[PDB]
C-alpha cells in the first residue's frame, strides 16, 4: 500500500535480446518495491509453476534478494526446468536446487526467435565430464575430446566444440520451437529484508 518505484520487471520479461541457455543474464531485483501483479501484463504465459511460494501470496512476503535469470530453451526441454530433474539442459546448462523457492515462467517466442533459415545464435551445451552444481554457469568453450588422440585446440573428426545450436525454424512443430524462460528465485539466508511487496 506504499508503492514507490516498481521493480523493472519490464526489463526482464519484455526484452529484445535473450541470452543462450549456457548464459543467464541474472539480474538482482533489489532496492525496489516489487509488485508481482505486473508480470501478468507482459505476455500470455504457457508455464507458471511456483515451487514453494504462492503466486497470490507473493505480494505480502519479504525477501533479502530476488534474482531473475533468462534464457531461450527448446519446447521439449521446458519440463527439465524443475527442482530435481535430469536431462541434457538440466545437468549441463542449468541445475535448479532441490530446495528451490521460486517461480519458473515460460512462454513461446516463435514469432521473435525463428528466422526462415534458422537462427543459430542460441547455443546449448550437450555434455560435460561432470554435472553442474545448483546455480552454476559455464562459458568455457574448450574443445571436447571424444577419443584417445589428444586435440590441440582444433575441431576435428574426433574433437568437438562443446556448444551446439538449436536452429529455430518457424516450420518446426511445437517442441522444437523457442521458449523464453524467466526463473524467479528468492533468498532469505542472512540479511535484512529489502525486497518486500507494495507495503
Amino acid at each position, epitope marked *: 500500500p506504499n508503492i514507490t518505484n516498481l521493480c523493472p520487471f519490464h526489463e526482464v520479461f519484455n526484452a529484445t535480446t535473450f541470452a543462450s541457455v549456457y548464459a543467464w543474464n541474472r539480474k538482482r531485483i533489489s532496492n525496489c518495491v516489487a509488485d508481482y501483479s505486473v508480470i501478468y501484463n507482459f505476455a500470455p504465459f504457457f508455464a507458471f509453476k511456483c515451487y514453494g511460494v504462492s503466486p497470490t501470496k507473493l505480494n505480502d512476503l519479504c525477501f533479502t534478494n530476488v534474482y531473475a535469470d533468462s534464457f531461450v530453451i527448446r519446447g521439449n526441454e521446458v519440463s527439465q526446468i524443475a527442482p530435481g530433474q535430469t536431462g*541434457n539442459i538440466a545437468d549441463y546448462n542449468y541445475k535448479l536446487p532441490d530446495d528451490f523457492t521460486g517461480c519458473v515462467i515460460a512462454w513461446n517466442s516463435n514469432k521473435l526467435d525463428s528466422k526462415p*533459415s*534458422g537462427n*543459430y545464435n542460441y547455443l546449448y551445451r*550437450l*555434455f560435460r565430464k561432470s554435472k553442474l552444481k545448483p546455480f552454476e554457469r559455464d562459458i568455457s568453450t574448450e574443445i*571436447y575430446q*571424444a*577419443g*584417445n*588422440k589428444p586435440c590441440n585446440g*582444433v*575441431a*576435428g*573428426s*574426433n574433437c*568437438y*566444440s562443446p556448444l*551446439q*545450436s538449436y*536452429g529455430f525454424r518457424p*516450420t518446426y512443430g511445437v517442441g522444437h520451437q523457442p521458449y523464453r524462460v524467466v526463473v524467479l528465485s528468492f533468498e532469505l539466508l542472512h540479511a535484512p529484508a529489502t525486497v518486500c511487496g507494495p507495503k
Partner: single-chain antibody
Amino acid sequence: EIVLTQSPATLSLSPGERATLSCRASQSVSSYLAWYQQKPGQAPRLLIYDASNRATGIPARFSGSGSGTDFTLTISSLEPEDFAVYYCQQRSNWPQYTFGQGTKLEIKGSEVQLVESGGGLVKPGRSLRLSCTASGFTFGDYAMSWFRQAPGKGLEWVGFIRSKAYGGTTEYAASVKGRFTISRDDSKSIAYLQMNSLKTEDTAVYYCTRDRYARYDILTGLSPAGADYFYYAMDVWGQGTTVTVSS
C-alpha cells in the same frame, strides 16, 4: 597441401602370400589414416580406421600399422578375393579429406543405406541437381560429405554440409568453389548438390557419405575400437551417380 603418396603401384602377388602397402605424408599427420578398398564398379569400403583399428566385418588378415609421416597396410595372409584398388585417406584437416593414388592388387600375372539420384548428359542445360536419400540413421545428427571419382583417376573431395547442431554452413574444395552448392532437407532426410556452371572435367562418379556424429554424448562411453563406435561414428558410403559431357 598434405599429399599422400603410395609406394607400390601394381602388386601382382599370388594368393597364399603376404602384401605390403606404404604411404608417405608431407606434413606430419597423426593417427588419422583410413585405408579403403574399391572393387571395380562397386563403392569404396573402409578396411582400417585410425591407422590401427580394423572395421566391423572384414577379415582379421588386414593388420595395418604406422603413425606420423609413414603408414603401412600389411595383408600378411592369403589373398582369396583381395583383387581391388586400395586407397588411403587422411583426416588431419577434418573438412578437407585428401586421398592418394592407390595400388592395384591382382590375383596372379545393414539397414543403414543412402542411395543417390540424378545423372546423365549435362552439356545441354549446364545445371545438374543431385540427391542423396537416407533410410537408416536419423538424418540430421550427422554431416554429409561428397566425393567424386573421375574415370580411372581416383577419389577426390567435393564439399560437405555441417549438421544442424554446428551450424548449417558449408565448405567446398578448390575446383568446385563458386559453382557447386550443397544444401540439406532434414525434414525429408535428403541432401542435395547443385552443379551450376558445369565443366568438362566434372565427369566423375559422385558419392554421398556420412561424417562425424554431432552427438558426442553417446561417443564418450564407447571405446573407439569396438563395433558400437564404428556403427555410430563412421562413414557410410552410398552408390554412385554419373555426369557426362559432349560437344
